[PDB]
Structure formats: C-alpha cells, structure tokens
Design a protein around this ligand. Structure first.
Ligand SMILES: CCCCCC/C=C\CCCCCCCC(=O)O
Length: 146
C-alpha cells in the first residue's frame, strides 16, 4: 500500500506461469486491441513459451512468442522481432504489474490478471502507471469489444 513485490522478479510477476495477464493501459499508440498473454508450456531453464491473443481488426488472432527471463527483465522474440521489457512494479500478490518497454522513446504498460485482482493492488498499479506515463497519452486495449 503501495509497496508491492521488492525486488521485482518477472517470473513471480507472471504468477510462476500459472495465469494469463491482460493489457489494460499503454502509452504505445499501436497497442493491440484486447491483448492478452498466457503461458503455452513449462519454463525450460530461463525460457517460457507465451501465446499472445488479440483482435486483428474484427477477428481474433494469436502469435507464439518466446520469453527469456532475467530477474526483472524480459526479452520477448517472434521471428525477426525482439522486444525488451523490464517489470518496474509488481503488486503484493502478483495481481498486476507495470512494465517499461525499452526503446528510443520508452513505453509504459499496465497488465493485470485475467482472473481478477484485489482492488487495492489494482489501484497501486494504476497509480504507478499514471506516475511513469507523466502527461503522455494512454490507450485502453481491454475496452475494444473484447
Ligand atoms: C505470462 C504473462 C505475460 C504477460 C506479459 C506480456 C509481456 C509482453 C508481451 C509482448 C508481446 C508483443 C505483442 C505484439 C503483438 C504481436 O505482433 O504478436
């Protein structure tokens, strides 16, 4: 309140591969509609296969990514694409987390359990996202007729 999980560990922030997370806030104007990530297999050493589901226009679509975990950092790969993230905030019970997408102009994202989370924890994630966004525009992918 609002001291979440310290230090942040990406695998624990993903409930150790036991849950799916939904994208609820993003500073990226290209954030995919209804974006959701769910584990597609067990963690092999430091590698976790993840299926991302979202709406591509009116139809549902899916992409199979490979996540490499390193402390709070996550390197996601698909074909020739590579996305580097750092989980900068993770709530007390891993009900939600805030990521920093590492690039020329870094983006900030809020992810929460598709199964639902405690209001107090969800509020802490929202607060942390608002602080890091600092006057930038925000997208709401979960409201896109999901
Ligand atoms: C197991 C919980 C994972 C939830 C956290 C998801 C983190 C990063 C997801 C980035 C995936 C990139 C989506 C881009 C859309 C695409 O082209 O497939």
């Amino acid at each position: 309140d609002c001291t979440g999980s310290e230090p942040v560990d990406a695998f624990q922030a993903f409930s150790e591969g036991k849950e799916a997370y939904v994208l609820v806030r993003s500073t990226d104007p290209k954030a995919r509609d209804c974006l959701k990530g769910e584990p597609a297999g067990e963690k092999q050493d430091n590698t976790l296969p993840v299926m991302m589901t979202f709406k591509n226009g009116t139809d549902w679509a899916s992409t199979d990514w490979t996540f490499t975990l390193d402390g709070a950092k996550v390197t996601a790969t698909l074909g020739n694409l590579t996305q580097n993230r750092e989980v900068v905030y993770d709530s007390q019970s891993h009900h939600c987390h805030v990521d920093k997408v590492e690039k020329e102009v870094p983006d900030y994202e809020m992810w929460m359990l598709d199964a639902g989370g405690l209001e107090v924890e969800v509020e802490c994630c929202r607060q942390k996202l608002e602080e890091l966004a600092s006057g930038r525009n925000q997208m709401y992918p979960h409201l896109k007729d999901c």
